[PDB]
Design a protein around this ligand. Structure first.
Ligand SMILES: N[C@](CC1c2ccccc2Oc2ccccc21)(C(=O)O)[C@H]1C[C@@H]1C(=O)O
Ligand SMILES: N[C@](CC1c2ccccc2Oc2ccccc21)(C(=O)O)[C@H]1C[C@@H]1C(=O)O
Ligand SMILES: *[C@@H]1O[C@H](CO)[C@@H](O)[C@H](O)[C@H]1NC(C)=O
Ligand SMILES: *[C@@H]1O[C@H](CO)[C@@H](O)[C@H](O)[C@H]1NC(C)=O
Lengths: 744, 742
């Protein structure tokens, strides 16, 4: 059957009056069908009574039934399309389920008929390429993903788990939430799926999968009513508690929390926002079958509601005023849709018809394209029958979807008698009032946290073996990158680079003061001795007289080594020191060897031969020294400062000292031959004393050298003062008696 | 009006009988509507009389008129859907224009009715989400773009320009062609578009814009016939020459080319392939209005065709057999579509109801989904009424688009007054043609349009369109963009080459310095010997000649610098060269200075005074040496870089030699004593020697500045000056002794 009301313009409608075997239509749906249909009739009466909207033209209706099946609705829409070619349908206000809306839109876009849908929220319907002529007064479903992502973010939760149901509702929402969470820098731990028919142990499987990765105590649900009920029951069985964030499927229903109330504490849920229409209740309460003849489906609804038959005349007793009335959620959207179409036609009248209250001949056919593209999509008005305080308004976004307002709820521990409570809303951004949720005002510890890793540069932010998680791992000694550590001989404050440590060295400003002073004193004394020696080259000529000058020269050479020693270490400096000690020591002892050899030589011997022998020994020691260092080419860090040192070892220096010791031993034996032989003021005793003194000095120095080689700050000083003391000892033991005798 | 034929199963059809104001559709379209309608009726009769194809089920028809409008098409197509929800239409074969097919497909997908189209070629219909119940026996258009890309790739033409036309055909084809060309590394030169209602001036402007860049001489057209005629013929009004590649818009039509045969010579065009059906000729010519009473629209067609009327009763005179007959191109596709539908239903009957030849109960509501999903798309058979030699087949791919076979044509004028079309190949799945017949493939080179020639390997392929870049090569500096300097110092471009260092030969120019050095050494030895022999004589024994021995040694050393300087560079060599340089002058100057000073006032103490100065010189040189590692030169022309020098700074050498310059003191100490009348005028000799040394030193100065660039000249001048000073000083000092002795 059809419902018809004559008028100048007729608005079609499509409602799910009967539910879904051989038959195509079953029992009557009370809440969704009859209440919404009567709401549409209420709106049409109120608009025709209003003297500002459509003063002249009267609106009619042509309402059909959908029977909750796409095939039946598509079959019935042929009536509208055929009438488009007795009464011409201006528009269609219908579509309760997503699929019926899809089919009717695909059929009607060809013949250019507008459509406004009051309760279709599928996300596939915003693609205006396929559905050119669609409008709706309810927001699309994917806004809930944005709202839930914002709610999660504002509480600082990063590690989350998601559960979705099979079908379009759970799926499309789940990819929407994933896309938004990726943008908001939120990482999803695991993603599950719940089927239509699933056993209790199979639900234990899902909750066990959720418990597989602990430390995630926030579970996002995008589920229908029955699936959520089973999931909460399964959570009750296994004594597992989380903090749940849900879509409008959970909503504020009481059935989903029934017999498993213990787990449902602290859930945050989102629901569509609505207010009661005061006059609709009064209008609906007074319906009776005898007075209401417009509605063809009122008799069957009354028979089903009051379980009575009309043939026996036993139905007159019952009345709707006795039973309680709970107004359905989406009546507001039906009234808003009808009013929006009315306002669009009113603007079209004010524009096209210049000065006639009645229907002008310019609109006898009505152009769908211009109406939809210009006037329908540009409607702004205060919502009819709005609450007195509120300021709700109706407006369509460019894509055709309506504006969105949501309510946010939590589950409250009232005394006991637990109940839902309101905590905020979502118009354009989250506007939570935190004082009214029992888990945040008392501040009992930190807010229930779902995060994997906490965020300085001191410890490297190593890549965790989950990609989202970043484990913090501290080189103390040696990092080029944030997660990588770099390395060398000789770390910066910024800790991303390296700063070169100073290269330690013995400086002249330091320990070195005394050696320098004694070196200058000895050098000056040696110069004066050389001068007084050359001055009277006379008592001088008796004892060789040439060994004396080289005797002074060796002492002078020794002094040169003292400055050589304490200097900046380089390859040149290392070569110079590795050579000079051998030359100095060798010459100094060689002179004495030759002198002692000549003493008592008769009991060959000539001025020319002695210098040849001395030069031969000096050259032998020098050649040994050259090979060592020539083999040991020179070059200048600890596992615990960047000291500079020559890599060459000291064993060769020990060998040079050993050759020197052999020389001194030969001197000792020769002086033992003739301890004090008087030839020229009896020098031989002085020679012997010098030999003993050199023996003692070397015996003190070389073992001390080996002992103190460990520490650098002492070793070089000990070496230099030791050698200088040896040289001054040689001077005092050899020259000094001759100095006193010839001086006076 | 509607044509209906009674039968067990009924097939619907759409045909544009009338063309496209108050009136809905006007004059009757003969070639496009009537011929194809008679084709469908012919196929249905033939199939109904066939022995082994649907033997017991008789097919019927329900044909409608589209009037070439989408809205009218939808209004008439409502009948098919209202039948199901009353002859129970099974499938619809129709849709000539693209828009009608799109609209009817959108309407019919809802109620699940299959559709086969004979002449809809738009690329939008390949999408399966929007239209999932569409199959066509004619290939889509972008196959033409693929074929064009292949044709251009075969002849190696890489710089081409594209001209398109407004309307889905043009932009869709051009987009497909650019995609396929970029797939095959073909770069576009210029793009242009032709409007709906441009004038002759605009066409001339388009031709001028095409001629703006002459690097391309091959033009790709995706245009309709009217635009093609105006563009081509307007290539004589302004003289121009190009090679044309065109879509089916040009084809083999004789109307598009008229009076502009010059500009159109050498063209290449692509056209769909079809073959005549001989039986249709007899069937169509045999038709008469009284005999063929079932067709509703034949009377109007005769009235329009022969210009007669029923009221005057003059129409009986005319007959169809008199006038010549020409076949429409897509009649093959019409018959193929009907036969494909029949074969699909036959497979349904064979598989689903294998027990009875007649119609079965299970089939009475025919399920569209099963038909389309399983039996329509997998049908393959021999084409009906095919030519005897050829082997064609009817099949559909996954998307419902049919196979594609094209023909390739080229213009040709041979005997005088014989301009005409000829075939040069085909395109079934890969391009195939022979150049044997083509006129221009060895009367000159192959006509080419390539922006740049291939770049040389050795020459640098400068990276400046993709093919636009020309070749720019370069000096001393492997790949296209890898131009790198071969280090400090020689390409092969295998790698950098390091030439051996320039070492002066141990050399003809160097011979002379050795000769003068040997002369100096021999003379100094002779002087030393004649001094040794003459020791007893008073002339030499008066001073004692101790300074004479050291002067001879200094002379020997300064001669020895001649050999020392000319040697292969080495760290030790450079160090010794630096060291001895000051040493020679210091020894000589100290010797002369001591010879003056000892009598300017212990003879052996004079040796000590000499020793102090020489030791100081030694100390300063060794300190300046040791300080900087002495060690062992980049230059242009890639031939002077072989030269190398010791790393020690040459200026530091001058700073060191400043001490010896201070010594060059000797003249100061000589000047005051010049008044004293020394025996044999020794002081005068010393002063003359100091002046001579100063003169030689002054002459030394310009040479260094002049030829610091050339190592050879500087070295030769330096050694020459040193030896000259040494020889002059020795001669001056020992002239009295030599004169007295010999
Ligand atoms: N608008 C709804 C939304 C619907 C839905 C609603 C709640 C839970 C699950 C669920 O599943 C899907 C899946 C895809 C698209 C839409 C939905 C419709 O049926 O289209 C429905 C509120 C309307 C009404 O019941 O009156
Ligand atoms: N198959 C065509 C292709 C058609 C077309 C054909 C040739 C030149 C231009 C041209 O313009 C467009 C533009 C967009 C889509 C289709 C076309 C159709 O109308 O769909 C047409 C051959 C069919 C017939 O006219 O019988
Ligand atoms: C969330 O973290 C931000 C960043 O430190 C902080 O400013 C804010 O106070 C935190 N809010 C809550 C509720 O923890
Ligand atoms: C086309 O180019 C290829 C690649 O160099 C070459 O092998 C072929 O011979 C060319 N053909 C013609 C006709 O130029």
């Amino acid at each position: 059957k059809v419902l018809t009301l004559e008028g100048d313009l007729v608005l079609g409608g499509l409602f799910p009056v009967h539910q879904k075997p051989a038959e195509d239509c079953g029992p009557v749906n009370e809440h969704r069908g009859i209440q919404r249909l009567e709401a549409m009739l209420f709106a049409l009466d109120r608009i025709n009574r209003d003297p500002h909207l459509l003063p002249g033209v009267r609106l009619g209706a042509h309402i059909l039934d959908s029977c909750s099946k796409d095939t039946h609705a598509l079959e019935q829409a042929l009536d509208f399309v055929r009438a488009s070619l007795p009464t011409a349908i201006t528009g269609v206000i219908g579509g309760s389920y997503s699929d019926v809306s899809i089919q009717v839109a695909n059929l009607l876009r060809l013949f250019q008929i507008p459509q406004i849908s009051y309760a279709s929220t599928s996300a596939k319907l915003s693609d205006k390429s396929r559905y050119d002529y669609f409008a709706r007064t309810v927001p699309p479903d994917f806004f809930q993903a944005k709202a839930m992502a914002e709610i999660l973010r504002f509480f600082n939760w990063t590690y989350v788990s998601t559960v979705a149901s099979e079908g379009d509702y759970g799926e499309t929402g789940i990819e929407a939430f994933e896309l938004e969470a990726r943008a908001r820098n939120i990482c999803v731990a695991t993603s599950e799926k719940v089927g239509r028919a699933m056993s209790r142990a199979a639900f234990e499987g899902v909750v066990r999968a959720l418990l597989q990765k602990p430390s995630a105590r926030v579970a996002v649900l995008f589920t229908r009513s029955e699936d959520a009920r089973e999931l909460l029951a399964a959570s009750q069985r296994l004594n597992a508690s989380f903090t749940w964030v849900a879509s409008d499927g959970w909503g504020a229903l009481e059935s989903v929390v029934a017999g498993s109330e213990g787990a449902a504490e602290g859930a945050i849920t989102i629901e569509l926002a609505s207010y009661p229409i005061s006059d609709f209740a009064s209008y609906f309460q007074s319906l009776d079958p005898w007075n209401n003849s417009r509605n063809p489906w009122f008799r069957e609804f009354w028979e089903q509601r009051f379980r009575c038959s009309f043939r026996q005349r036993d139905c007159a007793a019952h009345s709707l005023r006795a039973v309680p009335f709970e107004q359905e959620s989406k009546i507001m959207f039906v009234v808003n849709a009808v009013y929006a179409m009315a306002h669009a036609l009113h603007n079209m009248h004010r524009a096209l018809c210049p000065n006639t209250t009645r229907l002008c001949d310019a609109m006898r056919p009505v152009n769908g394209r211009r109406l939809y593209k210009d006037f329908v999509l540009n409607v702004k008005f205060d919502a009819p029958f709005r609450p007195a305080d509120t300021h709700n308004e109706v407006r369509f976004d460019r894509f055709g979807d309506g504006i969105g307002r949501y309510n946010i709820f939590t589950y409250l521990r009232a005394g006991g008698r637990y109940r839902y409570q309101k905590v905020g809303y979502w118009a354009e951004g989250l506007t939570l009032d935190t004082s009214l949720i029992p888990w945040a005002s008392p501040s009992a510890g930190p807010l229930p946290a779902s995060r994997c890793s906490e965020p300085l540069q001191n410890e490297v932010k190593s890549v965790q073996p989950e990609v989202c998680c970043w484990l913090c791992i501290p080189q103390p000694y040696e990092r080029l990158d944030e997660f990588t550590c770099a390395d060398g001989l000789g770390p910066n404050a910024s800790l991303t680079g390296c700063f070169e440590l100073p290269q330690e060295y013995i400086r002249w400003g330091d320990w070195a003061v005394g050696p320098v002073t004694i070196a200058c004193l000895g050098a000056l004394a040696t110069l004066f001795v050389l001068g007084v020696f050359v001055r009277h080259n006379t008592v001088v000529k008796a004892s060789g007289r040439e060994l004396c000058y080289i005797l002074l020269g060796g002492v002078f050479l020794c002094y040169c080594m003292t400055f050589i020693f304490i200097a900046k270490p380089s390859t040149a400096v290392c070569t110079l020191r590795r050579l000079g000690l051998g030359t100095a020591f060798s010459v100094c002892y060689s002179a004495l060897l030759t002198k002692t050899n000549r003493i008592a030589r008769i009991f060959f011997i000539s001025p020319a031969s002695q210098v040849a022998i001395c030069l031969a020994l000096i050259s032998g020691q020098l050649l040994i020294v050259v090979a060592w260092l020539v083999v040991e080419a020179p070059g200048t860090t600890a596992p615990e400062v960047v000291t500079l040192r020559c890599n060459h070892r000291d064993a060769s220096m020990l060998g040079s000292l050993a050759y020197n010791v052999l020389l001194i031993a030969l001197c000792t034996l020769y002086a033992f031959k003739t301890r004090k032989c008087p030839e020229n003021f009896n020098e031989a005793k002085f020679i012997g004393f010098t030999m003993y003194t050199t023996c003692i000095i070397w015996l003190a120095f070389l073992p001390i050298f080996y002992v103190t080689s460990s520490d650098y700050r002492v070793q070089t000083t000990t070496m230099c003062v030791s050698v200088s003391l040896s040289g001054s000892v040689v001077l005092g033991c050899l020259f000094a008696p001759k100095l006193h005798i010839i001086l006076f």
